[PDB]
Amino acid sequence: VGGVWWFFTLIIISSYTANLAAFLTVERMVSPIESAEDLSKQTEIAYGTL
Amino acid sequence: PYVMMKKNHEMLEGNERYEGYCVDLAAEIAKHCGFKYKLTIVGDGKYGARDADTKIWNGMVGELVYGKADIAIAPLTITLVREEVIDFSKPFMSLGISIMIKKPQKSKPGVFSFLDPLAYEIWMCIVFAYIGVSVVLFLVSTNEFGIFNSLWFSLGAFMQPRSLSGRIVGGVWWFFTLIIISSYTANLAAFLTVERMVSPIESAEDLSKQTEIAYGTLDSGSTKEFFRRSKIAVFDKMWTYMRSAEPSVFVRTTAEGVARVRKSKGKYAYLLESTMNEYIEQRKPCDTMKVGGNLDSKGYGIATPKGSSLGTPVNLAVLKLSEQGLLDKLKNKWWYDKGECGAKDSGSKEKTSALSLSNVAGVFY
Amino acid sequence: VGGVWWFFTLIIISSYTANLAAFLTVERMVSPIESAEDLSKQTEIAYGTLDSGSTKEFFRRSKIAVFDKMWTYMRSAEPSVFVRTTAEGVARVRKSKGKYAYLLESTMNEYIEQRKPCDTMKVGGNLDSKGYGIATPKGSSLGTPVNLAVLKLSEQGLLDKLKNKWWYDKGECGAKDSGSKEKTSALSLSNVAGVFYILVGGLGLAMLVALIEFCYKSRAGLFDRGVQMLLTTVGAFAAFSLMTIAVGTDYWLYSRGVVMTHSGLWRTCCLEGNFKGLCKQIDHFPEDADYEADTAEYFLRAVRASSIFPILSVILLFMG
Amino acid sequence: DADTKIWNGMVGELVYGKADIAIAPLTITLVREEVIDFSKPFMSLGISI
Ligand SMILES: O=c1[nH]c2cc(C(F)(F)F)c(N3CCOCC3)cc2n(CP(=O)(O)O)c1=O
Numbered sequence: 001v002g003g004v005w006w007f008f009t010l011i012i013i014s015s016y017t018a019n020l021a022a023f024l025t026v027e028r029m030v031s032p033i034e035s036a037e038d039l040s041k042q043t044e045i046a047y048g049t050l
Numbered sequence: 051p052y053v054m055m056k057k058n059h060e061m062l063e064g065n066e067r068y069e070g071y072c073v074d075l076a077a078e079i080a081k082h083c084g085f086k087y088k089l090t091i092v093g094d095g096k097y098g099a100r101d102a103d104t105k106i107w108n109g110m111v112g113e114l115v116y117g118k119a120d121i122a123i124a125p126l127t128i129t130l131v132r133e134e135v136i137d138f139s140k141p142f143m144s145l146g147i148s149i150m151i152k153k154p155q156k157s158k159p160g161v162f163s164f165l166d167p168l169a170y171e172i173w174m175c176i177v178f179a180y181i182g183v184s185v186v187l188f189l190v191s192t193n194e195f196g197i198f199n200s201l202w203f204s205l206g207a208f209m210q211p212r213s214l215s216g217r218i219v220g221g222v223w224w225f226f227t228l229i230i231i232s233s234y235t236a237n238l239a240a241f242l243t244v245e246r247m248v249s250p251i252e253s254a255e256d257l258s259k260q261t262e263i264a265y266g267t268l269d270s271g272s273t274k275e276f277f278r279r280s281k282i283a284v285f286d287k288m289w290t291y292m293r294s295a296e297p298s299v300f301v302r303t304t305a306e307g308v309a310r311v312r313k314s315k316g317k318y319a320y321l322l323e324s325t326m327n328e329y330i331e332q333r334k335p336c337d338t339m340k341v342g343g344n345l346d347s348k349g350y351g352i353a354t355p356k357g358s359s360l361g362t363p364v365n366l367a368v369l370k371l372s373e374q375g376l377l378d379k380l381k382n383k384w385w386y387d388k389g390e391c392g393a394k395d396s397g398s399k400e401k402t403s404a405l406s407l408s409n410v411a412g413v414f415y
Numbered sequence: 416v417g418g419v420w421w422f423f424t425l426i427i428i429s430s431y432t433a434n435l436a437a438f439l440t441v442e443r444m445v446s447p448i449e450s451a452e453d454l455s456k457q458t459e460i461a462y463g464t465l466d467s468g469s470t471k472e473f474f475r476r477s478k479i480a481v482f483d484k485m486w487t488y489m490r491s492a493e494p495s496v497f498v499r500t501t502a503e504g505v506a507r508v509r510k511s512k513g514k515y516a517y518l519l520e521s522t523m524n525e526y527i528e529q530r531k532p533c534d535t536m537k538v539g540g541n542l543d544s545k546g547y548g549i550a551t552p553k554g555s556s557l558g559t560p561v562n563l564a565v566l567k568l569s570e571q572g573l574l575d576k577l578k579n580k581w582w583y584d585k586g587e588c589g590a591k592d593s594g595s596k597e598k599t600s601a602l603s604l605s606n607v608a609g610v611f612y613i614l615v616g617g618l619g620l621a622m623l624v625a626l627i628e629f630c631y632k633s634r635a636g637l638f639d640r641g642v643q644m645l646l647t648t649v650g651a652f653a654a655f656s657l658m659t660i661a662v663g664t665d666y667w668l669y670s671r672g673v674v675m676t677h678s679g680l681w682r683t684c685c686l687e688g689n690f691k692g693l694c695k696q697i698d699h700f701p702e703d704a705d706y707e708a709d710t711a712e713y714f715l716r717a718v719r720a721s722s723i724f725p726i727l728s729v730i731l732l733f734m735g
Numbered sequence: 736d737a738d739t740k741i742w743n744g745m746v747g748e749l750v751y752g753k754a755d756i757a758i759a760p761l762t763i764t765l766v767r768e769e770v771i772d773f774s775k776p777f778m779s780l781g782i783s784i
């Protein structure tokens with residue numbers, strides 16, 4: 001019971017660690033528009049003129 | 051998207067009422083051949099078949115043979131049966147039979163999301179070495195005395211004095227498990243960062259080699275008749291399956307087929323013309339995709355009455371348009387540009403993140 | 416000591432784990448191509464066409480978005496991305512380790528994929544729609560007949576059959592395509608295996624110490640106590656002497672730059688063609704490297720101070 | 736050839752009566768369709784990677 005419970009918590013804490021690494025990796029992946037070419041390369045942010 | 055009724059078609063007249071690939075292709079042909087034209091929709095709304103009994107042609111091919119029209123600009127397939135009665139210009143669009151499945155990318159936890167990061171082969175060896183250490187320690191410390199000890203070394207196995215021998219064993223085994231759990235953690239993080247979900251495999255041969263995923267064609271048409279008459283290895287087996295598959299793998303209309311693929315959770319594939327397929331992929335909710343290359347080589351062409359004056363001119367016009375990349379341009383305009391879906395844009399969209407319960411659940415059971 | 420050592424190993428194992436993750440995260444990031452648009456969106460993988468032919472002239476005259484950019488690149492790409500013959504192009508793809516792509520007719524491409532050593536593959540659909548045909552003199556008698564014949568052959572699947580006969584069946588490979596299926600796509604046992612061997616090695620070492628230990632016990636060391644002191648003293652003296660020899664090793668680092676440069680803490684030397692060596696005796700080395708690196712003073716030289724201290728401490732220890 | 740305005744290869748041997756028919760991977764181009772006759776395509780292709 002102590003062994004299986006240990007293996008159980010091992011997986012969870014490993015999952016938490018791995019997942020938390022991903023939330024910071026993706027947090028860096030996000031890039032903000034720096035030029036016009038950035039408006040054409042993406043579609044999430046709509047844009048227009050007069 | 052070859053010929054469609056414009057939005058405000060009720061407020062328009064003449065050729066302005068229609069819009070599409072062929073509508074634009076008409077203007078182009080007319081420009082290079084120099085002539086005015088009047089776009090008209092075929093009565094019966096058929097392409098070009100021949101009733102065996104009455105021996106009468108119907109649809110566009112019919113209106114050509116009986117002098118109802120001067121030329122046919124539509125997705126008319128270039129077939130031998132038609133080439134005999136009318137004239138076909140060179141193909142303005144090559145196509146064939148393709149495969150349509152559900153939208154790629156899925157889910158699923160099944161404690162099997164924990165055995166994946168760590169390969170099944172690795173889970174095995176880590177268990178073999180597991181008992182491989184509990185047996186080595188067992189030799190360190192009459193029949194029952196060996197059982198109580200083997201259960202104690204198995205408890206020293208189920209992980210957490212100075213007998214140097216078994217001492218370094220516990221240390222090395224600890225360093226061993228340390229590396230593994232570190233690898234599992236690191237690898238699982240990669241998984242939680244990229245998180246790419248592939249799918250099956252494009253290859254009509256893949257549909258024949260398996261049975262889990264059902265598949266069929268239209269109950270009536272060249273598509274179905276193709277497999278029936280096909281003497282090719284792969285396509286043969288496919289037909290044999292569809293011919294006796296229950297329930298019926300054939301659908302009434304093309305819309306029904308697409309609906310069956312969108313409601314089977316990827317358990318049903320639909321075989322249809324690549325042209326119409328590619329178009330469907332660019333329509334909401336963007337849950338269908340074409341896989342693998344075409345099964346055969348076909349092609350549409352401009353049909354003109356046998357021995358017509360527009361014959362040669364139109365033929366050259368088609369060749370001229372293709373070389374100027376005007377044909378490819380038109381297709382891109384109505385298929386992808388005018389489209390709404392997206393595949394290379396969904397992969398270019400770097401954004402997502404959130405934990406669920408599926409994977410963690412497998413460890414609870 | 417146990418606490419600080421624990422905090423020390425904690426940081427290391429955390430570093431190992433984190434670092435191992437980036438190598439696996441990027442390992443997944445890698446996305447082979449698949450379309451022509453992929454060749455334009457990137458530059459790491461060079462690509463070109465035949466220096467002369469409809470293939471090259473296609474991109475030049477093409478007014479299509481993607482193909483336009485591609486031509487712009489190939490038009491001024493250095494070195495020349497264009498090859499003399501088709502054989503040269505294929506050879507360039509087989510010798511660039513996947514750094515060079517070659518654009519050619521699908522027909523010839525598909526055939527190459529079915530030829531040894533089966534190291535080439537076609538990716539994505541065609542860029543344009545072409546087609547071969549039977550040519551007959553204008554206004555010939557064989558005109559119409561042949562035309563219908565071609566249509567008849569295609570409908571009977573005879574054309575498709577012929578292609579399969581000479582492209583895929585004629586092979587051959589026929590093996591390199593079954594391995595290209597692209598089945599595998601995960602981690603691996605390789606790396607983990609290395610940790611298994613070091614484990615069994617540790618178990619074996621213990622199985623040796625066990626027997627050895629037993630033997631020792633049976634025997635039961637007093638001899639060493641007497642000659643052990645003398646032995647340990649001379650071993651220490653030998654180690655200290657060699658430490659001093661190590662520090663002066665006219666070779667603390669060699670910075671190849673074909674000449675040959677080798678340095679220690681005292682001299683910087685150079686061996687010129689051919690064989691003649693010269694040294695610039697300087698003695699230890701803090702110089703004007705604007706290092707600092709953000710404190711004040713200590714290095715270079717700091718290593719001098721630690722080595723000198725070590726030898727002085729070792730002398731006092733040897734004596735006492 | 737732009738200068739001599741002479742056809743070469745198979746397409747040439749057809750226009751100058753050297754041969755009766757050409758059965759080969761001859762591309763169906765506009766420039767050729769003007770001087771000779773092309774049957775329907777017996778093999779559709781294109782430019783690949
Ligand atoms: O000349 C012909 N041109 C055709 C053109 C198309 C389209 F692609 F939609 F333009 C289609 N569809 C494909 C998808 O399913 C719905 C309709 C069928 C055609 N058929 C009937 P076939 O006998 O099944 O080939 C012809 O005869």
Ligand SMILES: O=c1[nH]c2cc(C(F)(F)F)c(N3CCOCC3)cc2n(CP(=O)(O)O)c1=O
Nearest residue numbers: 467468469470501519520522523760761762763
């Ligand atoms: O009618 C034509 N048919 C052709 C057929 C083929 C092949 F695919 F090999 F059958 C090729 N090759 C493709 C690969 O490089 C080696 C030769 C060139 C052809 N060309 C020359 P283009 O001017 O470069 O198009 C023609 O003119």
